[PDB]
Amino acid sequence: KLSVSLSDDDVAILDAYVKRAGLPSRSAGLQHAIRVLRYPTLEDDYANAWQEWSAAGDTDAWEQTVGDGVG
């Protein structure tokens, strides 16, 4: 547990995010923020991972399961 000093606008942004995302606490909001700071190229990581996945044919391999448990 720490004590931080932020501006009124900072706490307003944080509270709006926590509200929109349905998070239980400002600490949860800040955890999301830190997790975003943590991975700067995550969008790129997803693009490349999906590219590997499609290039290997794995969506065709696993697609027979897409309807399991439903219907």
């Binding site: 509200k19 349905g22 239980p24 969008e43 999906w50 399961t65 897409v66 309807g67 439903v70 219907g71």
Partner: protein
């Protein structure tokens, strides 16, 4: 302003064959994070993760969340089944319906943490 993002409800095709193959056509809540979702929308293609939704309320379990027609845009009251979570190609997105309320989204986060043993 639905943009294919987390918490949004979309009608998706869950049939392996798709085409003229009937049924397996369900609403679903997007639960993949919005960096992934925004990447899929930017590329026009990707792999998202959704929680299927059913109008058969039946017995409600702690890993399922009641979704109300008043807020979601669904025609009837439904139930998100976190135990049926699955990743799908964005090609299987059919039609945006709306999004869950903030309360419904919080409880869907709870249900996911329970189903996947991610409570801390």
């Amino acid at each position: 302003d639905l943009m294919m993002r987390r918490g949004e409800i979309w009608q998706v095709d869950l049939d392996p064959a798709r085409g003229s193959e009937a049924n397996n056509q369900r609403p679903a809540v997007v639960v993949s994070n919005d960096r992934a979702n925004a990447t899929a929308t930017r590329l026009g293609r990707g792999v998202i993760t959704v929680v299927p939704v059913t109008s058969n309320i039946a017995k409600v379990y702690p890993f399922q969340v009641l979704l109300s027609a008043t807020t979601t845009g669904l025609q009837v009251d439904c139930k998100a089944q976190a135990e049926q979570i699955r990743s799908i190609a964005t090609e299987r997105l059919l039609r945006p319906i709306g999004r869950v309320s903030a309360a419904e989204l919080a409880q869907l986060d709870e249900a996911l943490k329970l189903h996947l043993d991610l409570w801390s």
